[PDB]
């Protein structure tokens, strides 16, 4: 299952290409400006087979709870209503969001104790690095 090394509180220390990733999602300028300034905390916890991923920032908070491999309804930080699935692949916690015939993926993996999130849509790739708090 998911490594217990994912569990805990993570703080964003680096973000590369987030603006173009948000543009690809259809996020408007004012929102992108605040999104680029945000340095969120991400909290990953588990209760039984239910994993919760909570994101906290001054601008927006989000929270998803899911079982691996089972589709769930998600509301994203930019208020998309998606159908999402999280899978485990070679230690990587991989989230796919689908809405209106579109798709984006967020792959979270542990690298030397950091969590690295790779966000992909329409060939635009964003990398966000988090440190454990
Ligand atoms: C990080 C999301 C909350 C704070 C920023 C919200 C600003 C704009 C909403 C549009 C961004 C939606 C995509 C967020 C992807 C975050 C991936 C990650 O966990 O690093």
Numbering used by the authors: 0 to 132
Sentences from the paper on this structure:
I43N and I52T do not alter the main chain conformation, and neither side chain generates steric clashes. These changes from a non-polar to a polar residue do not induce large structural changes in the crystal structure. Also both I43N and I52T showed reduced solubility compared to P2wt. I43N has a Tm at +48 °C and I52T at +52 °C. Therefore, both of these mutants also have decreased thermal stability compared to P2wt. The lid region and the β3-β4 loop of I52T also fluctuate more heavily than those of P2wt. P2wt and the I43N and I52T mutants all bound to membranes with affinities in the 2–6 µM range, irrespective of the lipid composition. Despite similar apparent affinity, the kinetics of the wild-type and mutant proteins were different, and in fact, more of the mutant proteins eventually bound to the membrane, giving a continuous increase in response during the injection. The results demonstrate that both Ile mutants can bind and stack lipid membranes as efficiently as P2wt. With extended incubation, the Ile mutants slowly lost the turbidity, as opposed to P2wt, hinting at different stability of the proteolipid complex.
